Hints:
Chain E: Its main location: membrane. Chain F is an all-alpha fold.
Amino acid sequence: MSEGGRIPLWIVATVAGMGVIVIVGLFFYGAYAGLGSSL
Amino acid sequence: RGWFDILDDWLKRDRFVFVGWSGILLFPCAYLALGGWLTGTTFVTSWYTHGLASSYLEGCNFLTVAVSTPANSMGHSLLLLWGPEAQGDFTRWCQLGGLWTFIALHGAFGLIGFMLRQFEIARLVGVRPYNAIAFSAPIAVFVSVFLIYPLGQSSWFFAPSFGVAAIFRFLLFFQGFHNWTLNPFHMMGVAGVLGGALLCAIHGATVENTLFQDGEGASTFRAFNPTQAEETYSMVTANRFWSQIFGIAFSNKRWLHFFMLFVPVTGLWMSAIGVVGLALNLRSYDFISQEIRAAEDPEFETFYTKNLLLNEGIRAWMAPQDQPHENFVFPEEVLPRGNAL
Amino acid sequence: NSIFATNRDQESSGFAWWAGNARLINLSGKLLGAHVAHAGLIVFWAGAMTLFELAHFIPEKPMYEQGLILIPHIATLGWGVGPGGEVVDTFPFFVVGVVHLISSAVLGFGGVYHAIRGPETLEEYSSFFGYDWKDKNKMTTILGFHLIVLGIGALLLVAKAMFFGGLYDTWAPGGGDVRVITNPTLDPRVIFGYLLKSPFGGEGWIVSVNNLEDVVGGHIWIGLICIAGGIWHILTTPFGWARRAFIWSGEAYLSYSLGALSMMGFIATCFVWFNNTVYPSEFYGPTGPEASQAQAMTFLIRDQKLGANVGSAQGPTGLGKYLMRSPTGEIIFGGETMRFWDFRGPWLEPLRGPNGLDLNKIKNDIQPWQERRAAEYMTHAPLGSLNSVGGVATEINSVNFVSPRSWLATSHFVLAFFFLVGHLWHAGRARAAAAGFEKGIDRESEPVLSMPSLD
Amino acid sequence: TILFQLALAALVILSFVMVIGVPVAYASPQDWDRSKQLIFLGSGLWIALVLVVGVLNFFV
Amino acid sequence: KLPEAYAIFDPLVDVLPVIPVLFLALAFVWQAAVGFR
Amino acid sequence: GERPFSDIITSVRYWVIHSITIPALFIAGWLFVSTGLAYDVFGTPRPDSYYAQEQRSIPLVTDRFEAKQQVETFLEQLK
Amino acid sequence: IAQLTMIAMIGIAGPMIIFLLAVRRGNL
Amino acid sequence: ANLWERFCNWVTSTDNRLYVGWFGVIMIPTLLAATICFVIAFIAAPPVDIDGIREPVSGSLLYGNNIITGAVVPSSNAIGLHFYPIWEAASLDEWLYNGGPYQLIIFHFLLGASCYMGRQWELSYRLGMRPWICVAYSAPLASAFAVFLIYPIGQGSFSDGMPLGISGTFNFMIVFQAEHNILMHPFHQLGVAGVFGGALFCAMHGSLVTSSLIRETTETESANYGYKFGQEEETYNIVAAHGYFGRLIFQYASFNNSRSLHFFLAAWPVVGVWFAALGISTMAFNLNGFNFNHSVIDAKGNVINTWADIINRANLGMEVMHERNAHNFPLDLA
Amino acid sequence: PIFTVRWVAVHTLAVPTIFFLGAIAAMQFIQR
Ligand code: CLA
Ligand code: CLA
Ligand code: CLA
Ligand code: CLA
Ligand code: CLA
Ligand SMILES: CC1=C(/C=C/C(C)=C/C=C/C(C)=C/C=C/C=C(C)/C=C/C=C(C)/C=C/C2=C(C)CCCC2(C)C)C(C)(C)CCC1
Ligand SMILES: CC1=C(/C=C/C(C)=C/C=C/C(C)=C/C=C/C=C(C)/C=C/C=C(C)/C=C/C2=C(C)CCCC2(C)C)C(C)(C)CCC1
Ligand SMILES: CC1=C(/C=C/C(C)=C/C=C/C(C)=C/C=C/C=C(C)/C=C/C=C(C)/C=C/C2=C(C)CCCC2(C)C)C(C)(C)CCC1
Ligand SMILES: CC1=C(/C=C/C(C)=C/C=C/C(C)=C/C=C/C=C(C)/C=C/C=C(C)/C=C/C2=C(C)CCCC2(C)C)C(C)(C)CCC1
Ligand SMILES: CCCCCCCS[C@@H]1O[C@H](CO)[C@@H](O)[C@H](O)[C@H]1O
Ligand code: OEX
Ligand SMILES: [Ca+2]
Ligand SMILES: [Ca+2]
Ligand SMILES: [Cl-]
Ligand SMILES: [Cl-]
Ligand SMILES: [Mg+2]
């Protein structure tokens, strides 16, 4: 169904939000490892 | 009805993203400028133009990535993909700095599209086109800094590169080589920006602290209606407050808002005029009377002569890496340095 | 049911979600919950952070090389360390950490209880635990219990110092060591002397406290002061002069505490930046002044080894290259470190005579341990980048270092600052709300419209 | 004893269960009488395991 | 290092300090669930 | 005159579509890099391609009109 | 892996409480 | 009517052309002292030994400066953070050589400006306004405290406070970049977003309200005559304004609640400038801008420079030149 | 197959964005 409301917006927000935190976290990790780490 | 009118109707439909005739110029140019930037900062080097890593791929971060200017040997080549330098080779084009001209030129036409959009929408809705007028300041800035400036210099190499740290380097170069902080056109620019930020803050605060009680809620936002006839805050109370605090106050709301347009827009216009001089090296570098006195009198020292010593540091220390096409070699013994450091 | 059915919404409370906690002002049960649970978060942090520190701690390497701020606090109290601050036993660190972290479960339990399950308001439940912000007498009584609790906390520092092993003393004769304090300073001329001293250079107000006897004695006075004041407040009610001076409301009280905590945060910032007695440099790294002095010591030593007569060496400006006079004549180190001549530290004081740095002692008495400590401190100066690249801003990547003193000064300045902004925000709002115009100007009764024109 | 390594693993698991369980109980409309019984039981267990880990510490 | 008996727990000890931050974030999940009413 | 985003992004249809397409684009980007194709498309140096083994001078383009050839020569000089 | 798993478990817990209470019309 | 009561009534009177108030009783004399000393020093003060190396720097007009190069020069590095009031000097000649004016002016100024901030709270309360204009002013005030007091404290000297002059300001800024790489510090970056954003939103708001003024005037007169001070009705059509802006971007990025709009105009530049101030105030304790010097290395170990490395060369130029006679040892540690 | 301007607009940005973020995620594992 194209039916809106089927997945509550708060769950979408929480999960997308954690997705962002994870991706950004990986990018910070990368600042200390491999290329760009100074090491 | 003709195809032109049929196209016009469709272009001007009220949809979620207004398109307009203006959108035909704006959307592609703005998209290609923004995507040009994201593409070069993610994937593209500046090794052959600058001797620099400049993409996430090489290990740079959001602060150090850039799309860099082409090498100085390119001069002011348009550097078209199909032109005589890259000759239609996309990879070579990237390596030669062609994304810099890509982004500058599409970015310029995109700004033209945006301001035309501002005009087109204002005409359709029936408001006066002051927003477009105000937009002339960003346009004067872009044009003087990214086009006129390098056009008066040796090549695009000396335009700002599109990047966070790269722009910082541009600031510091202007200090060391142009003494740009000494320029009164820059100083008017500073006044318009800081005075604009001041106006933005003080007005926003003033309205929020002279609001009429129009609801029972402790959070006061809900007590406003887009259609209400009445001012939401007291101009009379605001005027009395500032008259007594500061000595003067606005009394006329139209003047107040026109002044908010005037200040930052005028400031940006003035800074653009100074950069147009800097395109020619027509700097406010020196005060002659100061230098004649200082040359004859080794005890005479002001903050103005202190800053020139810092500038001399900047040029000598930064020039060999910043201007690799010059092949500078400055033996250690010629570098200006104070004691110990 | 309805989404608006509870009192936890804008429609019932008059506060938007982003001002959600203001709904609690007159809900003493849920408010007690919020507080207890918050206190749990503070305790949890102290516990979890200590254990993280310990899991990461290489005990023979200096603490200040390892991004530690909690282990240095525990070490300063005498736990886990011996002469020169050497770590002799990590177990007391483990204990402090575990016990905080266990205690946090209990505060958290109680806070969640009061916040979501227990009675919303305490007044129906109990006249002792219930309160009205406007009940001045009840306000001073709770203040008084807390004063007594704080007084006790201060006596616990005294107990540790006097009866339970002592404190780490960087000034201890023959080298830094844990020492039992048997003779705390009680003379009020000394103790309150500190409070009346200027906060400017060479004076430094209370930040200048420089021996454990003064620190311990000061906590005896604070302890008693606070317990007496607690009793005072339980047995009295505010005088008329005070009733007329203040605003009497929960938000007003919050604002007073905000201004006080701001002030304390700025004070803490100065304490950790300048004080090397209750913040031992063995644990926190040298202070800015200390490391600058140490550089001058370092080159004084090196050049003197090469044959330099450091007392008579004229530098380029005419002032001594190594040694010069302060503006009141004391012999001090030269170069830019002339600003830091009020610096005092145990590696340096043996070179000091009545007139300041003593040329005979510098020529004859510098020990290899002084040399090593001046070198260590000079190469651990509290300069470093946000990403923890140690050294000046133009230094290349290589050394992972930001001094704990910098972490702790910058954090507390940022906190003290926002707390002053909080104070202004809540003090102004509490005034507006008590007078009845926090929601805006009455269109029907606009006060300026009743005032004469200014001109 | 290194059963320690499990008494601790007990307390850790129990802990994760209380952390989800207690606030869900407290705000759940239905079986509060049962929920309340189990929370006393979790709490007593937890306090127990902490004393156990505590004492056993000094053996492992 | 932690006393060696506790070593198995190192990876958990490393994540603990961040938990207080997850509480602030939790306030927002919650508020989104009661529709920021 | 069109559906609100919050109706779209809370719908099963949306998530069914996008649980395929989002991971697919993400993975295609990942492989654009992990297969090294990103280097070749953009002419960016790999970590072992900034310098030939001994040299310490940068391959700076110095000639506008044979810039294409110069870069080619620099690339051949990487033994 | 051990670190990322503790993290994912601990992180899931908060949202789990909200999700559970939401599901059973609890006192959110 | 007690005399004290009459005095208190006059002090707190809402009818004084300029409000006095209790904050005003401190603000007035301290600002007048700062201003008068500033003006006399700027015109006539002799050279000042700022770096404590007996190398006096001329700040005043009569001693060879113009408006751009003149300054009241910071007190001597030999002073450090010591309190140096006139009466601690043997003579006015000594006080002048050592930079006494600078202490006198900055301390009265900071006290006076702090009282300016309280005075804005105070008058708001007298007039029955909401209380937070003073909160907005805390942003530039915080920034003044950062450069005149907090920086001196962290570095150990008022010789390192910002000079009171146009070129001396630029000097301060360049030295600061060399010593803290402030450009690469996120709080200064937030500052920039705050002031460029403030100026953008100032222009935008001004242009949008100007665009939507209701016709009340003819062509031969200024539109400003279409608004009368204290009129009840709004003077522009907020609905036309929003109809324009919502289409310029898209409907939902436009503010239709004028209270929300004005709150955002307040908050953006104020928050960005609180961060600017905190940048200077935490760089005071040498937690500095990001350092990516040699962060990018090739397969062999060769440094591959980025724009950060070029910034670092410009910084080195500033560092090795500043205060060219003041440093005897290899590290500039304050 | 019926598209809107908005749909086109959202996807010209959203589609490259995800692709780029995968690319950048991969780069975090490159070693010199
Ligand atoms: C309005 C949209 C628009 C605009 C204004 C531009 C503008 C530009 N592009 Mg961009 N471009 C666009 C969309 C646009 N582009 C799109 C959608 C793509 C993806 C395909 C690109 C991809 C692209 C690339 C890859 C490059 C450019 C480049 C350029 C620049 C040079 C263009 C040029 O020389 O054209 C020349 C052609 C014209 C001006 C066409 C004019 C046609 C005339 C009017 C016909 C004459 C008819 C006449 C009346 C006949 C009379 C008959 C008579 C005999 C009787 C310029 C800044 C180059 C650049 O940026 O280098 C740095 C470059 O390399 N563009
Ligand atoms: C320290 C941070 C903190 C604390 C302690 C509180 C505390 C509280 N808030 Mg405030 N709040 C906060 C931050 C905080 N808030 C932030 C950052 C915001 C903005 C997002 C808000 C916005 C806000 C609003 C808008 C409201 C509150 C309200 C409340 C109260 C009732 C909450 C409720 O009914 O939950 C219902 C929710 C649940 C039952 C979901 C689960 C909640 C529990 C506590 C989770 C526990 C997790 C933890 C790991 C448990 C392990 C325990 C273990 C020891 C056994 C409560 C006392 C409400 C009010 O004032 O009541 C009158 C109210 O309307 N808050
Ligand atoms: C007094 C507070 C304080 C201080 C001084 C420190 C200091 C330190 N920590 Mg600890 N820590 C704290 C609280 C603190 N931490 C909290 C609350 C947590 C839970 C997240 C931690 C968890 C922690 C871990 C897990 C680690 C440290 C480590 C360290 C060191 C490295 C710091 C670093 O690189 O930061 C990097 C800098 C930042 C991330 C910048 C923070 C800037 C914030 C986001 C902006 C401030 C805004 C302000 C508060 C208000 C805004 C309001 C406005 C909008 C109105 C340093 C010794 C590391 C260490 O070396 O361990 C041994 C380490 O691994 N800390
Ligand atoms: C400031 C913190 C604080 C305060 C003022 C209160 C106050 C209250 N609680 Mg709450 N609570 C707290 C924290 C607090 N609690 C914590 C941490 C927990 C988890 C253990 C609880 C769990 C809890 C439950 C489960 C209940 C209450 C109840 C009550 C009410 C009656 C208590 C009583 O009967 O007294 C008499 C109690 C004593 C004489 C025993 C006190 C001795 C203590 C344990 C040691 C004292 C030493 C010292 C001061 C401890 C300091 C600790 C510090 C280092 C952190 C009252 C509203 C009851 C209520 O709400 O009824 C509906 C109720 O059922 N509490
Ligand atoms: C958290 C601690 C705390 C708090 C919030 C309060 C709050 C209160 N006290 Mg209690 N008090 C405390 C601790 C506290 N007290 C302790 C430990 C003691 C024992 C000494 C007392 C002994 C005490 C007495 C004897 C009295 C109070 C009174 C009061 C009330 C009015 C206070 C007032 O006007 O201050 C504001 C102060 C003034 C208006 C005087 C001006 C002070 C100068 C100008 C400030 C200079 C300080 C400077 C800024 C910085 C510090 C350095 C300095 C040493 C140089 C108020 C309810 C009064 C009352 O109503 O009791 C029933 C009262 O008579 N208190
Ligand atoms: C150039 C070119 C072209 C084009 C291209 C394009 C068009 C592209 C696009 C592209 C794109 C379109 C891309 C995108 C990307 C994106 C990204 C990469 C993103 C990122 C992001 C992020 C990372 C985020 C972050 C954040 C923020 C910002 C804020 C806060 C939160 C966070 C932190 C999360 C062509 C072919 C024509 C031709 C040739 C040349
Ligand atoms: C109210 C509210 C809130 C808040 C809440 C809170 C704040 C709470 C608190 C909480 C808490 C504060 C909790 C705590 C917990 C804890 C615990 C649970 C602990 C445990 C421990 C353990 C288990 C231990 C272990 C160990 C040992 C013993 C040894 C070493 C190792 C280890 C670590 C393993 C919010 C915001 C959400 C919103 C809504 C409302
Ligand atoms: C422990 C220690 C010590 C000692 C300490 C002490 C002994 C302290 C004390 C402290 C104190 C003894 C403090 C005090 C404070 C006070 C204050 C802080 C005040 C405040 C006030 C106010 C705030 C007021 C206000 C007002 C006015 C002025 C007018 C009317 C209105 C009102 C009421 C609002 C020492 C250093 C030796 C050493 C180290 C350790
Ligand atoms: C000590 C211990 C413990 C403890 C634990 C705990 C205490 C926990 C907690 C936990 C928690 C407490 C969690 C939480 C989480 C949260 C989260 C994960 C969140 C997120 C959020 C977000 C993502 C957001 C988003 C959003 C929204 C919602 C709306 C608006 C928009 C946005 C997008 C922003 C255990 C048992 C392990 C055992 C061992 C020991
Ligand atoms: C983009 C260039 C704009 C020039 C438009 C000229 C349209 S031309 C115009 O078109 C009508 C129907 O379309 C015809 O009926 C008419 O005969 C013809 O002159
Ligand atoms: O005084 Mn002004 O500037 Ca702060 O770093 Mn050191 O000291 Mn001097 O040098 Mn660089
Ligand atoms: Ca309700
Ligand atoms: Ca390799
Ligand atoms: Cl200088
Ligand atoms: Cl020096
Ligand atoms: Mg990497």
